[model samples]
Structures are given as structure tokens and as C-alpha cells.
Target: VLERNETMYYGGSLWSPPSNWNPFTPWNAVPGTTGLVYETMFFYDPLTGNFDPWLAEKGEWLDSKTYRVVLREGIYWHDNVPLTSEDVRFTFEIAKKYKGIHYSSVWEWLDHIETPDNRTVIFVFKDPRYHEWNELLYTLPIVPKHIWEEKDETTILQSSNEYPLGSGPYVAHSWDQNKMIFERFENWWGTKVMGVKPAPKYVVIVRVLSNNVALGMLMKGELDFSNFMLPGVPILKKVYNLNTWYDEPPYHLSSTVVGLFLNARKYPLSLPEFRRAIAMSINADPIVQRVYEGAVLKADPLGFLPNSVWMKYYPKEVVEKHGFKYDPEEAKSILDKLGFRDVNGDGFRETPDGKPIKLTIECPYGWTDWMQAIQVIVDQLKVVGINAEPYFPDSSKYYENMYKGEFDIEMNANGTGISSTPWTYFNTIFYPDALESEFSYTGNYGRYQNPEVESLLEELNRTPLDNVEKVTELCGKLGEILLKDLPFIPLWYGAMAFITQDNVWTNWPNEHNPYAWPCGWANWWQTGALKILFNLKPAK
Candidate 1:
């Protein structure tokens, strides 16, 4: 059998073989590959909005447009070479030279970077994106200049980067199509800097293709932790002694907000009153209880998670005055007042101009939860004299239709994950210009366009991070516009899908011992998965 206590068995991060290990090309790099191997300058906790020092000793804003970082002393890369500020300068400069690097957009706001000494690096921005720049501080990983300077642009951008060298606690070990292993670096800097080391000597992440495979492996103790949305987890908790973050219902943290994206460029959907009526027509309780089985939390009308971090920016009076809820009679009354009538004696309502209104709501075909939720939405929409049909397209076609704005209405989860501020949330929904022929690949899939919303988003982008009063005021204005426009209907917050088995490894994160997010996915390393690793121990 595998080494019982020394290894941690992880699942649901990589579903395919090792695609690429180059942290520079993050779109194809394995999730934890950027984090557990290479490390970022800072570690940002989304739950608490805390930025703890990682590679850098500390960071401070020299001015509104300039930021300075000092490197930690005695840190060494996996190759035993001392890491310096030159490497930090080289990492950001590489992005300026190569437009193909995912973060090349950094150059848009950056004026220049300076490395005055071996331990200090400075950045000056011409026009700042405060929200995005703060996020990049904790998301971008620094690369060694000695190694990457020898590589050509093509090789640096495309290499598989096998046996990678990084400054993190773990070094890339062995890997195959099915699994990848990371071995602990004996002299990791964190052991001295943070005064602790990861408990496991080896971390093995294996691919579990389906929920069935994950469920069986977790039940049999073959998997120690899984981040998959498996069915019947409560029963598994009872029988197999598995554990989620909570003991009762809604057993996991609600992170992503799922909602309906109505194509505002389309006929009746273009009207604000019609959109408000549609929002009021659908009941989200059934989706919360019947579909997710109380694992999901209801979304705030402002379309952000209902957590302390997000709630700080909430405008209570604005939402109370303009927000929508589930009431079919009220929805029908609003529609009728707006002059929608059944002209053909059919059960469905028509537009004020006597044009037929046929709406199709869609999600991906294989997504069973979303497919069932769409059915519930369609039934509720039909009750208010609207003709609504449920459509199940393949995943590829579904995204194609969404990006092209060819669908009437569709369901999408948070395109913007948990970030340091609510500005990212507003930017995703309102900043991208919808007047273009196609939507921005980043977000704004509903093709929503409002000049006031656009101007307010720019102001929020320029707002300083420390100015909470200004940030809250700007967010309140954006929230007021969003509630009045009803660009999209907020449904509920989806669970993070963190479930752990303590048969072999104990001390997984929960409500009580919540040191970090208990997730096996690669992107979660920055979210305190590395901290979770430090907190884990072998079961006695």
C-alpha cells in the first residue's frame, strides 16, 4: 500500500494529464503547479481580505502610482541559488516583452519598474487599475532570471517545464497521465520565515474523472480530500465518516454566485420593466432546497456573496427600494401594466406591439444540477403568462451562444472568483463595453450597456484600496444602478465543493479549525491551501 501518513491523496484538481507546467502560460498550467511549486509575492485570503507576506518580506505604496517591495532575506530557489530582487524585476519585465503572457496587460497601466538593490524592487504606474494591481500582487509568481534569461521567447512560453525549480515548499516530483506528485523541499524558506512546514512529505494529486469514481475512492479511503461536487455526501458523512466544513446543512462555504444572464439587446428583454418582471417571476427556493439540497446560500440582490467581506459594501436602502423577489402575481401585474397581452388566445403573453414573446432558457446539457434548475425556472416563468422553454445545448455550443449573445437567457456562475474587493464583481458585470459586435471574453456576456454604469466603473477602478469610505460610496452607486437596471437576476451562491476524509489525514478545515480553505484544486493554493497543508496531520 501507499505510505499511509507521509502522503496526502488529493482529487478533483486535474482531470487530464499534465498539460504544461510553465507558470508563465497559466491557462494550460496545472492549477497548483503555479502555487505549490512556484510561489507568489504575497498570500491573499479572500474570506478575510488579508495579504500575508510570502516571497516578499513586505510591500508598501510609495505613492498613489508607485509601489515598492522588499525581498525576504536567506530565501533560495529549488536549485539552491539565492533569490533576489532582480528576479522580481525580470518576472514583470518578461510580461512587457511578451504580449502572449497571460498578464501582459500589466503594461497598460505600468510606467516602469526599478531594482535599485539586491533586495528592493519598485513599480510605477501611469494610470492605475487599483483593484487589478492589488490582485496581481498575490496572483503572479516570480521566476528565476538566471534560468529564464537563457531561454528563447517561444521556449519560455511553450515549454512543458518538467522538473521545475521554484521557491515554494514543494518541488515537482514524478508525474504521469493519471497523477502528479510533489515532494517537500527539506530546507524550504517557509520553515524559517513562517516557523512551520507542511506535515506531508509527498502530496499526490490524482485525476478522478467522474463523481462516481470520486465517491467510491473517498468512501474506500483511497482519497483523503476531494473538491468535487459529489451527490449524497451527507449519507457518506454518516456511513464513511467523511467531513465537510459544516456538520449540518449547507455543509460547505458558498463562494460563487450563480445567476441568469438575460440578453438585454434582445426584444422584450431589452426593457427594464420586463427584466424586473422576469426576475420577480422565478422562485429560487426550490433550487436551493430541491436541487442543491440546502448546500447553497441565497445570493444578495447586488449579485455578490452575502459574506462580511462583500456585505461591507452593500447598500441596504438601495436594494430594499429596487430589488426583486419571487411573486408571480406581482410580476404578472407589472407585465400587464406595461401593456403585455395575450393577443392570439394562447396562454402566453405578447409584447405591447402585439408581437409574440418566446423565450428559451439554457445551461449545459451534462450539468445535471443546472439542467434541473433550468426546469424549475422555466416552470416559474410560464406561470406569469410568458412562454418559456428549457434548452440543453452541449457545453461548447452553450459558451459560443453566450459569447455571441445569440441566446434569450442563460445561466452562468461567477466568472469573477473571490477577489480582494467588490470592484472585481462590478467590473465583470458592468465595465466591459457591450456596444461592440461581440462581448469581451472576460465578462459582460449579457451585452449590458449604460453610460453611467461605465463611468462609475472607471471611478471605482481608480479608487485607492485604503479608502474604504470612497470604495463603499462608489459601490453603492453601482449597486443602485444594477438594482434599477436588473441587468441579470441573482439566484444563489454555490458551494465550494470541499469535502474531506479523516480516515488517514486529520485536522481538515471546518467551522471550528478553519485555518484555511480545505480545497485540493490548484487555484486554491493562494486561498490558503498551503496553510491547510501546514495544519494537517496523520491520524493516530
Candidate 2:
């Protein structure tokens, strides 16, 4: 049996299970989707950041706005139901209805989805969305329609509430409130075609709230793996020895960044120099070393890109301007130039309007070290005559406040993955219009809008994946514009660390680590990870 500390649930702040197990709906899936019956046309190699065809034989774009995909023959649902173009067309239509987080943005420009034949699928966009084919075909999980057609639209969240039935290697066998059980699909259609075998005899996901509890369970031999080590680093060290397991620090996987988000719409920070001064005053290296224990790396101006193709476009100037290298004197000068005077000589700058430039840093509770780091930042900002305070709220209320733009400066975690391509994240977060969208109101909480930034985003959306040079150029331009604007101060990417026991049979597939995708089985033709676990025998 494969054991895990907790199975992610629906509607949680950080990460949760896909709402309908459907990838197309706008709000359905979180950053990662699992325990859902879904399949994708292609797979992503985490190490190389490359997409290989999975259920689809081939995929390409007929034009900037239109994508064409040809499906592989003989694939069938776990119920012995044949997979056909009609199912594909129906799934896309359903996706159009709700527009879940990722797919919603990608399909925004889409005019209609067409299935010309049993094996062929085409998506035509309202306007030229350059990477539409690559992102939609590669990232969107194809849902089986036969089981879902009878479900009510209003209750779709609870509808089709059945175990896995896709052509993937595993089928959901049972689900209790605390755990979801997955069993290997012996005659899975992709097994022979992809030459992969099932690994675990049964996979069990145990739901636990706190990381400490999860760690204790793993050390006691009740759990096989713990993803996103929430209990803290000390607990991870104990698990390493107690559970006979190894813990690896996050690699070039997800681009996890934690930083301060200034509410530009607020006072004092409404000025550009004030924003730049605050950014220049605080040094992130100390925070990384003292608070994070050097687990995280400083962010690049273009956010955090770990070994991605787009990392090349992150120019040095962009890093110099936006990254935290710390120069307190320069910070002071910028504040002085902004007419912030220390008239009372209290060492705090006062605005020309006679009010102190006070700001609050709102962060979620439980991040003790992160809160400490924010205190250090508050001190540094104070040196430049800016008064900053740290506010910790309950985790449940954190996202809601952020969406409402309730604070002056807020700290939050932004998660990235193999599928977190430039278009998917950058456009969704930084773009002005995307602020109105649900998944990322935090991106433009400051309401910082620039025509150049908007145009660059438009160009990025219209640039095709095949045109790497053009895409790279556009991304570079966007990064430069953002740096000049100082809309967000890039802090550090969170380290993706996990602990797994030695006795359990599992392969840490390169791309899906940090978090696993629901459609991972569709990415790799064979289920190597699942197969490895299936053959394992319990330790004597």
C-alpha cells in the first residue's frame, strides 16, 4: 500500500482537488489535480519541460487562434466505454460553461470547439491566442462525458460523484471523508500501448490538517509519503531518520515565491518612488537565511522560473532592478526625492500631506518564520522613514481579504508547476484585466495599469509556442515593463520539500513532484510510478 499524510480537498486556500475533476471549467481544479477521472492528450517531462503526446497521436496549430488535435485509436474508459471525438467535443463545451481557473483564461479567446471526425478535434478562437493549442491541448484534461451527461448543472460540484473511470492506469475504488483509495486498472487501455505497468496494489491518501501531525504519522510508519512538508524543516529531519527515508529540498520544479504585495490603490504607496524605496530598503537574503534557513532562492524580476525555457528571457537588468540585493542609502534617497521629510527628526518620514507613510503587511497565520521575516522588513522600512506593521490573520480569511484588496502590503505564496508556463501564470496574474478574474485578484490589487504592460500581455497571448524567439522577446519586454513599474516586489521562491519512506515502492516522476497532476497518467504513456508501487511487498 502507498500511504500519504493528507489528500488535498476541495475549496482550501493553497491547493485542493479539482472541483468536478474537469480541467476545462474555470474554477474546477487547483494548481494540481488528482483523484479525478481525467485524461490529457500529452505529457510533460519535468526535467526537460517538454510535452509529449499522450492520448493524442499529434497536436498542432492550424493558425494563431485555431488548434488541431488527432487522437490515438482504441483508447477506452475504465468501464469498457470507447473514447471518441464526441466525448472530446462535449467536454470542451462543458468547460466553456464554467471556465475553471487555468482553462478559463486559455479558452477566453476561443470561438468554438469542433470535432470534425471521431479522431480529430479542433478549437477555433475569437482572436489569435498564440499558445492556445500547446496550452489547451497539453494542460486541459479530457473528461469522460457519458457519466456526466445526466448530472444537474446546479449541483455539478457534487454530481458524477463516482470513483475513477478514465483510461488511465488507476481507478478510484473507494472514498471515505478522510481517505480516497485508488486501485490499479489491470487492463487499462494505455498500458499495452504505452508499455507502462501499475506500481501500487492500492494507494491510500490520509487527510490530516497540520504538518506536525502528518510528520508524526509518517514517522510511525502509517504514511508512505508526505508532499509539501507543512510541519516545518525540523520535523522533516526527524522523519528522515525515524522513517528510514530521505528528504530532498525543492529543485527546479515549481516557481514558489513569497513576497510583499503593495496595495497601490492605498495612500503613501500610491506614489511610485515610495514603492521603489520600500523595495530597495528591504534585503531578502537575510530573510532567506535567517527565516527560511536558506531553503528558498531570491526571485528573478520575471518571477521565479526554475529551469524553464522562458528562464532564458529573464534579462540581467530585470534582476538588478527588481531583485532584493539591498541598498539602504539608495532607499533613503528615493524616499527623500519623493518629498518624504523627517521634519520632527523622529527617523520616520512624513508625507507632504502631513501624514506618516504607514503600511501594514498582512500574512496568513502559522508562518511564524515568515512573520519574523516581515518584522525585519518592517524595521528596514522604518529606517527609510516608512512605518510598516505586520498583520497575521486566520488562514481561512487570508485569501478573501486579498481578493477584496483589504490591506496595504500583503505577503502570500504563489505556486508554480510544470504546467505553469509563462502565458498561464504571467497573463493570469499580472495583467490588469485578469484582476477581475477569480483565480488571481491579488496580481493587480494595486490597480497598477500601464498601456505597455497591457500590450505586452496581449502580444504574449497571441504568440504561438512554436515561435519561441518571438515569445521570448515578448516575455522579456513584459518583464522589463513590470520592473520599471514595481507593481510587485519579487521575494523568494518556496522550496518544494517532501519526505518518503524507504520501504514504499515509488518513483518521483520529475515534473509532477512538489505536486502531482490528476492527468499524470495521460502524460506518460505507461504508469511507471504506479507500476513500481504495485509490485512492492510490505517490509518484514
Candidate 3:
């Protein structure tokens, strides 16, 4: 719901009341509105898997090793200072200048980048790959040269109340512990360029996410959009005024895909066959139908997001080789061979060490969808004569234990939201670096590592980004090994439920109304839904 002056209430972000706007660190750069105050050189079209120019005029490839970009003219920083090519060059270099930048690794290949003029910048590479280099352009956010130059490297990365200057539509109006508000800029560059203007006057991001509180806010016209899996579609539909982008199930493609993680450092889970047996026993139909409320797609065996444009890389050979099957007898036979026996009459099996073959399945306490799914998992495990109990912990403690490889069984998101490449999906959850050491902050939550698989992932990360044949070939070889190793068991991807009240802010993205992203608090791959801001229509 919006106030009289077109102030829209948005409550999808999980940001604590007081949050950092620095878009450099791992924690600070967690998408959503992080890029709302900034714009990249290129805009990523998530629907089409193509790159489009926004702040940047389309790039010109002078040669295999040289690229030149012309920026959009008449663009200005938040304070109306003209944004020049120097600012763009400075922004990319800030990553190198600062100590810990999430995107620094992506553009490390820039041998020398120079601004030839106010509107044009040239990138010269020693050895350039068209695909990976272009991909980084779509993700890197440019900063203001004047504002950022004042601070040394240390101050740039520090969490602070002083907001960064922006070239995007809205500016952070205020930041406090309870809520953060964004006021749409009076002279957003898009108004003249795109011939459209953002309808909402103010965007209020509230930090509370209790399901009931959100639903109540929706009903009271106090909140216009919500990302939390709502109570139920039936209940929501009955509201009459409130509506989601989707009318029914398979709600929308998720940003990050979900997966079941088995700790290799732990007992039976350490056995690939045991993990395979566990995977075979757990059926996804109930989890999809009940927890997801029939609004999710069963993930591909490799656990790629359902919206993956790289599905072409997942050839039939890969599925047949490493894919899992849901067979109770197959699970029992595997466990039986592994010496898990019913020594107790309680119907659950005991391990070879004469201990109950029990597992503690866990996720964040507030993530009710995951909690419900874990309940279904516990029930599924019971039918296989396995003992499992659902557990929920606060996110900080939960990840602390997960990173240390301290958990037996866990469920967490396994991919990035960007649709440009599937490499992010694999690297975040299955990267081998975390497996070789104690560092778990950079993903690899399952503690999965294999030299061959790592080698392929490295090539996938290093080689040509958009080279279809070459990318697919590397991915094809990698898929073969990923399926055989049950490092991260496949699960369902949550359908992004971008529930909104079109009564006030109409034309949200949907099957028929496919415009803005079908999410409120989403993990946008690059420029995010910044385009969608101007696309919003004031309700008739």
C-alpha cells in the first residue's frame, strides 16, 4: 500500500534495521536494493540471457584483446555532478585499492583501463576472454570519482552512516535501526531516457519478517509488496484486494536455488553411498506440494536453478551418470549393505557401531518454509527406518556451525541469483577451496571437494564466459562428476512469491504481466530490478 503522495511500502528485504550501504564486502553487497543507489556500465536481461547497455553505451570490441565502451551522456551523480569516464575507471579500480571486495576477483584481469575521454573508456587485456569479461561488466557497480576519492582505501570499505553517491533512481532517504527509507530522486536520468518514471515516491524497507505481521501489514494496506512465502494461496486469495504476480502454483522462478547439504566430515553422511541412500529415500513431491504449496519446480539433479539458461549444458549423459533416483528398496538395500540394522524395535535402524542412525536436520529458525520442508524430511526419513529430527537455529549460530563443518545434515540455498552463468551456482555451494581448509564464508557449505571436479570448475570459472560450445563442453564434463558425487543432495527451488497489492501499485511481473521481477527481496544477479522501478505504474 502507498500513502497519498505515492509512497510505496516494500518489506521484502531481510536487512536488520541498521544496515550498511557499502556495496563492496560480502555482507554489504548482498543485492536487493544494494545497487539501487548505483548503476553498472551494462544492464543484464535476466529473461533473455543477454547484456544490454544502460549507464554505458553499448561496448565495441576493437579486437580479441581490446574493448572500448562509450557511456550514456547526460547522466549525473545524486548531487547533480556530471558523471564522467574517470568515475567509471575509478569505480572498477576501487576493488583493487580496497582490501576485501566481493567483485575484485572477477575483474582481476584488467591489465590497464584508461578513460580516453569523458564519454569513452578503453579496457586493454593481456589475454581476454569475451564471455567472462563481459559478465563482470554486467555485475560491477560504478562509483562517483569525487566522493570516493576523498576517502582512503580503509574508509571506503568500512560500515558507515554516510551513504555513497549514486547514479541510479533512488537515494537512501534515511537509515535507522527500525527501517530504511529510499526516496525516489526528483530527476532520475531514466525519466527522459526510458520515457518512463517510477510511480512510487518513497520505498520503505522494514526489517521485520514475522509471517503474521507481514500478512497483517498487507491486509491493512501498510505494505505493498512481500517476499516471505505467505501463509497459503487459498488464504491469500480470499483477501480479494491483495494479490501476487502469479495466480497459482509454480509461483515464479527462485533467485537462489535450494539444496540439502550432507556434511562429509560427519558419520554416515561421509559415505557417498550413505548420502545416496539418504537422497533416494527422501521424495520431493510432498516437499514441493506441501511446503512449497505446489509453487516450486523440482530442481535438476545437478541442483541448477530452474531458470538456468545453461540447461542446454546438462546433457542426457550427465543425468544418467550422476543423477539420483527415489527408490525405497534401493535405499534400504544400500543401507542394509552398509550394516545399518534394526537392533531396536522402535522401527529406526542403527549404524554398524551399534548407534542409532539418527541425523539432526536444520535450517534458520525464522525460515518457516525450510522448517516445514525439514519436517517433511524427518517424516520421509522415518519411513526408511532412519531417525531424523528437525532443528532450527538463528542464522548467525547456524552458519557458524555449518562453516566449521560441525553439522550432520543441513538445508541452505546453493546458488547465486544471476542467470548469466551456472558457475556461480556450483561455486557458492560446491567450491573446493572451503573443503581444503577451515574457511567457510565464501560458500562451499557442504564441504564438498574433488580435484577433478575442482579442476573443471576452475576452467568453468576461468575459461570463456559466454562461449556456448566451449562453456557447454567444460560444463558437460563437470556434470558427469557432480552427479556421481552426492556432495549436495538436490532439493526443490522455492518459487519467488512476489506478493503485492496491485490495487495501488499495478503491473508487477507475472505470467501474463511479465514486466518487473517476480520478487520483493530477491538476489538479483546484476543491476537487479532497478529497471523495474521506473516500470511501476501508479494504480488507477
Q: TM-score per candidate, in order?
A: 0.97, 0.84, 0.89
Model 3 misplacement above 4 A: 1-5, 25-33, 60-67, 106-108, 126-135, 159-164, 174-178, 338-356, 414-418, 520-528
Off by over 4 Å in 1: 437-439
> Per-prediction RMSD in angstroms?
1.5, 4.9, 3.2
The lDDT of each candidate is 0.83, 0.60, 0.71
The window of 10 residues in a row where model 1 has the poorest summed lDDT is 431-440
Between candidates 2 and 3, the one scoring higher on TM-score is 3
- Candidate 2 lDDT over residue span 1-540, tens digit each: 334322221111223332233333423322222322456777654334566677888877776566788888888888888898778877667655655334555455778878878889887778866554555555556767887666556544434345444667666666555555666678877777776554454555455666676666666656665554443554455436532112334322343556666777777776777777888787887787777655566775557456554564445555565544478898888877778888777778888766766688877887787788889888888877788788889886777777766778877664333342576556534658644654455366556666677777777777666566777777767767666656677777765444455444344333443223212232222212232332334443
Compared with the true structure, what per-residue lDDT tens digits does model 3 show for residues 139-188? Answer: 66777888877777667777563555777777877756767777778798
Q: What is the lDDT of residue 324 in candidate 3?
A: 85
Worst 10 residues of 3 by lDDT: 519-528
Error of 1 at 227 (Å): 0.3
